[PDB]
Amino acid sequence: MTTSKERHSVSKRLQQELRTLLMSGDPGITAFPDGDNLFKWVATLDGPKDTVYESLKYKLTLEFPSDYPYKPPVVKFTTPCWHPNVDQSGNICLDILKENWTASYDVRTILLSLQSLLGEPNNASPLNAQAADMWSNQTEYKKVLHEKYKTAQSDK
């Protein structure tokens, strides 16, 4: 029991990240613990401006492992996301969420990066071949995208 300078705990890191996030005020991005659970957040992301995803809103979940921040959280879309790098279950293919993860990244980085990925997909090895293929026609893509988005809301 000497001093107290420089410490750590997952709950502590999550609090600091939740502060920097809320204080930063990035447009179209919101994130808060599921409620009383600090290890499970529910986030909201507005589609990036000047892209076919503009005006669209997506809900996600971020589940923080016992190793955070030395291990990436599990980020999934709860709102169906028709995108080249997203599957039907909502799982995402994002570099920073896998081999590129560094504990120097925060939740803000993940959400800002993901928001931008919507308008900047990586059609190399797609989780959604139909979206990857249709990306070359932005007029038809916007049509299909908004159809499914509206239909997902109407149906269950």
Add this chain to the structure above:
Amino acid sequence: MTTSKERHSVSKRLQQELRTLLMSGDPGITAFPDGDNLFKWVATLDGPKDTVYESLKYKLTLEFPSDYPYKPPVVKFTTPCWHPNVDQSGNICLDILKENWTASYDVRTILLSLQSLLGEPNNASPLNAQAADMWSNQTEYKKVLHEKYKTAQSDK
């Protein structure tokens, strides 16, 4: 469409209150929107120190009406609270939550005030006559309080 100085909206007020709360860092107090709902928060309050409620933890919900902050939120205990000013349903009898409400109060005030009410009840007109009556014997009160608290966790 002239300027933009000095504005309002419930969602805006709630955001500023959620910031001041998280930034303040009051010990034993936590509060965040139910998730994606900003009009319904789930809070956590640790029993005040140097009282029979020390070491006890309570979960609550705060439901913000369409008139906030000119109308008080509905604060209820989700974790059963054996207290003179609290009923079996979790409803609370707190001055600032009724006739004493002022839009100049925030969620931090409510939670700090309520946390202190645990060790400072108003036995005048009790919602729980059994707790109000037993308050005069702090030894027996602490015994009953902790029994029920532990039993509520075990049972449903």
